Amino acid sequence: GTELPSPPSVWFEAEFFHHILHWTPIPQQSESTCYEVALLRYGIESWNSISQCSQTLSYDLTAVTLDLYHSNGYRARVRAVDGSRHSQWTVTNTRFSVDEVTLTVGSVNLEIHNGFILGKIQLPRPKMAPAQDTYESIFSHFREYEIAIRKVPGQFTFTHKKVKHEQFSLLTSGEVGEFCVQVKPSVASRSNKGMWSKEECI
């Protein structure tokens, strides 16, 4: 064809300080084709190229979006390039802000006590996150957790419990041997989706 096609879509998929941009490839993409990713900070009419060429279908924009939780977000865009020709830019439909960040927990600790199990929810400590910029710092109130408990041995069924803190307690009936837990965080004041955690057993 005359000109090169544009990436059909461009969108973000982020966790706490894991701001990865994504896009769908153009059709009939030759090996020699790559993509140019550019960033726009809301409140400044001026784009900035981040990668002149990327032979992937995603890019980690965290290093450059470290201000997400203190800003009004960004606008990201991509355009395919092959040789001297390129396509139209395809910008993200919405403005990327903390609202589009999928909540996750760092991990979960389970302890055997008196006659119950004590859970300690460890929040995400991404390595690149500014020192002062902590999870509790960004989301200082209304942090809640949906909890899933599965007994083992046993079938693949779970008991759902709701907790208002990073530490919860589950009374024990005794008869059960091992228990496995997973956690899903949220913030009562926000509509952010949350990511279920990985199985954690005793």
Partner: protein
């Protein structure tokens, strides 16, 4: 206070219902709501700033929208109600929206005044000195 965390999420959820419609139509990228507005909010003129902003959206922005793009008219409206709702709870919790809170003493008095009919206009005017005194007292408390 009561249940403001949920009132926020409601407002937010209502917004996600029209987020993609609008943020796809706005091709300029300057910030309308400057940080300046945030500062007022942090200042004594805070209550008035917040009220003017709610008013702004409810009377200018949203109506004009619903009547410019019917598609999301109902959606824009649903969000608007979520705002009115949130407004009520705010002044029903003093600390937040007092500048929209009408004095109870004044209501009672306006009643007594009207229950005095024509006898009231004289009572009001005759106590004008008492009024200045209160005004005066009030100032002192500054």
């Amino acid at each position: 206070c009561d249940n403001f965390p949920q009132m926020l999420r409601d407002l937010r959820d209502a917004f996600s219902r029209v987020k993609t419609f609008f943020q796809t139509k706005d091709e300029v990228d300057n910030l309308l709501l400057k940080e300046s507005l945030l500062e007022d909010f942090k200042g004594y003129l805070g209550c008035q700033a917040l009220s003017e902003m709610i008013q702004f959206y409810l009377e200018e922005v949203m109506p004009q929208a619903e009547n410019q793009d019917p598609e999301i008219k109902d959606h824009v409206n649903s969000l608007g109600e979520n705002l009115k709702t949130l407004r009520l709870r705010l002044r029903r919790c003093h600390r937040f929206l007092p500048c929209e809170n009408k004095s109870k003493a004044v209501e009672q008095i306006k009643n007594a005044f009207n229950k005095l009919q024509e006898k009231g206009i004289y009572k009001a005017m005759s106590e004008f000195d008492i009024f200045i005194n209160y005004i005066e007292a009030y100032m002192t408390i500054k």
